[PDB]
């Protein structure tokens, strides 16, 4: 979502994992991954900007 | 779509033609230029419109007219476009804009009668042709040059 900084730190450095915030998703980020793990808050925030 | 199986749409990308790469391709050895002459040289050719030495066509013809410095051009809208408003609306240059019908109203709007209205408008604009005003007033509305 947002200043969820402890989670982004914990998820760095894992060689299968990429981390993006909900105001900064590109087309190339979603196509390259096999799955998306999004939180409930971030999902509504994406629905707010793609409208 | 996966990044290891991309495919453009058919007919959308073409390859390229490379001249001077052997005889069997079709364009080796002079690369489509024929034999000798001014057109076979690098940077060869004559300027656009040149004709050898015959008098070029622009130079046998006479000049004509002048530009007026106070010229007025308007931004016509005919009569069908006034059918996308409700019966009774007072159409105007700001309601025409903000529907995008007219952007860039050059020297003001001018209404033209081509060809059929059925509404109850009250049109405000800068000019009216004789039949535009007429058909506007038959259908039952009013005009005002302003």
């Amino acid at each position: 979502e947002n200043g969820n900084d402890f989670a982004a730190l914990s998820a760095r450095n894992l060689p299968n994992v990429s981390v993006v915030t909900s105001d900064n998703v590109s087309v190339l980020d979603v196509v390259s991954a096999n799955k998306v793990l999004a939180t409930q808050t971030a999902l509504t925030q994406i629905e707010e900007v793609l409208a | 779509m996966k990044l290891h199986e991309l495919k453009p749409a058919e007919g959308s990308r073409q390859v390229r033609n490379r001249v001077g790469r052997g005889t069997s391709s079709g364009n080796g050895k002079t690369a489509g230029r024929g034999q000798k002459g001014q057109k076979a040289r690098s940077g060869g050719g004559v300027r656009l419109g040149f004709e050898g030495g015959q008098t070029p066509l622009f130079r046998r013809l006479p000049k004509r007219g002048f530009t007026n410095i106070n010229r007025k051009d308007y931004a016509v809208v005919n009569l069908d476009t006034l059918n996308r408003f409700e019966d009774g609306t007072e159409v105007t240059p700001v309601v025409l804009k903000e529907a995008g019908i007219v952007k860039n109203e050059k020297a003001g709007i001018k209404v033209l009668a081509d060809g059929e209205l059925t509404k109850k408008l009250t049109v405000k604009a800068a000019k009216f042709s004789k039949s535009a005003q007429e058909a506007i007033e038959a259908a039952g509305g009013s005009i005002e040059v302003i």
Binding site: - | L48, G49, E51, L57, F58, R59, R60, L61, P62, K63, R64
Partner: protein, 64 residues
């Protein structure tokens, strides 16, 4: 850079509604005692540009 239009052609020609080019006529400034009244009556009407001339002229008038 941008393409430049031929300024001598633009002073002599205009573009009609279906894409053509209206033009004036030659032999219309000078010795009219050498030509017949029917000639000078019929050299007063405008005409258009031919296809050989247009093919070679098209790019110089692209913008006006």
């Amino acid at each position: 850079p941008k393409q430049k239009t031929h300024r001598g052609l633009a002073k002599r020609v205009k573009r009609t509604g279906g894409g053509g080019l209206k033009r004036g006529r030659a032999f219309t400034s000078h010795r009219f005692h050498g030509k017949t009244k029917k000639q000078r009556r019929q050299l007063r009407k405008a005409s258009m540009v031919a296809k050989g001339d247009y093919k070679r002229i098209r790019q110089q008038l692209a913008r006006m």
